[PDB]
């Protein structure tokens, strides 16, 4: 099951979402259980992974990953909420581009053996699950990169909410890999 375009659905019990601007080279493959693998290069913009839909406030995610990025790429819990429309990330690892760059710092949170700095950014007239919109992005960026472990979402959501970053109703919630004008390979197994 190799994707040929942006797509969503459920595979082996796990929701999957793959979004691509169709550029560059990419092969996103749905694999056994909660696993997926992706190989990419060129000048593409994409993000995809496996997880759940809808996401929940207290989900405890356990994942493993063989992550090998080259350029601007992220390995992170990724999802959206509506009312308000929010795109959020719990960055476990990243490439050459630090998501915190020029972002508004909103404190930090210690959870699952790690420490994460919190940030808020904004996307204007950008693609979203509701079409072209202007919305905020919330971030939890690990101070030390890792490619496997447990992520207690309640600790991140509560840290954001308390910092004044409101969350809406949950849309999807996945362990995603993202890339922008980058290359690499990744095999991620959720659950
Ligand atoms: Ca299924």
Which CATH number characterizes residue 82's domain?
A: 2.60.120.180
In this structure, what DSSP letter does residue 131 have? B
Task: Report CA(29)–ligand 1 centroid distance (Å).
Answer: 15
Asked if 186 and 75 count as a contact pair (C-beta separation under 8 A), the reply is yes
CA of 44 to the centre of ligand 1 (A): 28
Using CB atoms within 10 Å of the CB of residue 65, give its burial: 0 to 12 exposed, 13 to 18 middle, 19+ buried: buried
Choose, from 31, 87, 92, 130, the residue flagged as catalytic: 87
- What was the resolution (in A) of this experimentally determined structure? 1.8
Separation of CA 13 and ligand 1 centre (Å): 4
**3 state SS of 158:** helix
Q: Is the dihedral of CA 97, 101, 104, 105 positive or negative?
A: positive
Beta bridge partners of 188: 36, 65
Question: For 18, what's the count of Cα atoms within 13 Å in the CB-facing half-sphere?
Answer: 21
Report the C-alpha gap between 76 and 141 in whole angstroms. 9
Residue 12 DSSP code: T
Catalytic residue among 31, 92, 130, 178: 178
120 Cα to the center of ligand 1, angstroms: 34
Does the annotation mark 31 as catalytic?
Answer: no
Q: 46 exposed, middle or buried (CB, 10 Å; 0-12, 13-18, 19+)?
A: buried
Tell me which H or E stretch contains 161: helix 153-162
Q: How far apart are CA 147 and CA 187, in angstroms?
A: 10
124 CA to centre of ligand 1 in angstroms: 34
What is the three-class DSSP state of 57? coil
Query: Residue 103 belongs to what domain range?
Result: 2-191
For residues 50 and 72, the answer to whether their CB atoms sit within 8 Å is no
Pair 136, 167: CB distance under 8 Å:
no
* The total number of structural domains that make up the chain: 1
Question: From CA 77, how far away is CA 100, in angstroms rounded?
Answer: 16
Q: Tell me how far the alpha carbon of residue 33 lies from the centroid of ligand 1, in angstroms.
A: 9
């Amino acid at each position: 099951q190799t994707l040929t375009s942006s797509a969503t659905g459920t595979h082996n019990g796990y929701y999957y979402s793959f979004w691509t601007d169709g550029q560059g080279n990419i092969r996103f493959n749905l694999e056994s259980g909660g696993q997926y693998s992706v190989t990419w290069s060129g000048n593409g913009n994409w993000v995809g992974g496996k997880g759940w839909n809808p996401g929940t406030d207290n989900r405890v995610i356990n994942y493993t990953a063989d992550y090998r990025p080259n350029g601007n790429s992220y390995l992170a819990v990724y999802g959206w909420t509506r009312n308000p429309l929010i795109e959020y990330y719990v960055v476990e690892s990243f490439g050459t581009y630090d998501p915190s760059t020029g972002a508004t710092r909103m404190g930090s949170v210690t959870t699952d053996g790690g420490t994460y700095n919190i940030y808020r950014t904004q996307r204007v007239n950008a693609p979203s699950i509701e079409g072209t919109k202007t919305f905020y992005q919330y971030w939890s960026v690990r101070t030390s990169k890792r490619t496997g472990g447990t992520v207690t979402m309640a600790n991140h959501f509560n840290a954001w909410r308390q910092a004044g970053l409101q969350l809406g109703s949950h849309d999807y919630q996945i362990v995603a890999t993202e890339g922008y004008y980058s290359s690499g390979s990744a095999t991620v197994n959720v659950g």
